Amino acid sequence: AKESTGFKPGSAKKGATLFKTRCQQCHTIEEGGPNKVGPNLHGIFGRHSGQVKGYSYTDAIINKNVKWDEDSMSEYLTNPKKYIPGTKMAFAGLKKEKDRNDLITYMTKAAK
Numbered sequence: 001a002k003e004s005t006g007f008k009p010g011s012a013k014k015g016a017t018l019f020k021t022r023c024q025q026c027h028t029i030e031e032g033g034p035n036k037v038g039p040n041l042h043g044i045f046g047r048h049s050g051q052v053k054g055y056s057y058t059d060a061i062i063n064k065n066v067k068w069d070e071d072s073m074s075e076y077l078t079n080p081k082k083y084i085p086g087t088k089m090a091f092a093g094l095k096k097e098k099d100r101n102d103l104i105t106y107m108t109k110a111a112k
């Protein structure tokens with residue numbers, strides 16, 4: 001389970017640098033930031049998957065229709081393709097809970 005074992009707040013400082021070194025290659029998170037390889041993530045926590053305007057998503061991500069929160073985000077980041085088979089996000093995954101917690105802490109702050 002997720003709504004059992006998952007998110008506990010971590011370091012936003014650390015999470016910002018994990019976003020830079022691991023996610024920035026394909027995504028922006030600031031308000032008004034553009035879509036790149038991956039879509040802009042501003043407001044992601046208040047949204048279902050495959051909904052940013054102007055981005056070409058896979059049919060799988062749309063169909064999955066996940067309402068993003070800390071728990072589903074934690075699962076997707078662990079192994080994106082295991083969580084949404086057919087997704088085109090090419091990211092090996094963040095296997096350590098500590099790393100995922102730092103990153104999500106950062107993301108929930110920056111995406112609002």
Ligand code: HEC
Pocket residue numbers: 019022023024025026027037038039041044048049050051052056057058060061077086087088089090091094
């Ligand atoms: C390029 C090599 C990527 C890296 C590095 C990361 N992501 Fe990504 N992401 C990428 C693509 C091409 C897509 C769309 C996938 C599809 O199947 O259509 C995504 C999607 C996401 C999403 C879903 C967004 C939505 O609007 O539903 C999220 C939440 C997301 N990506 C987050 C994310 C994070 C936090 C990353 C760093 C650990 C990261 N991605 C890496 C491409 C790439």
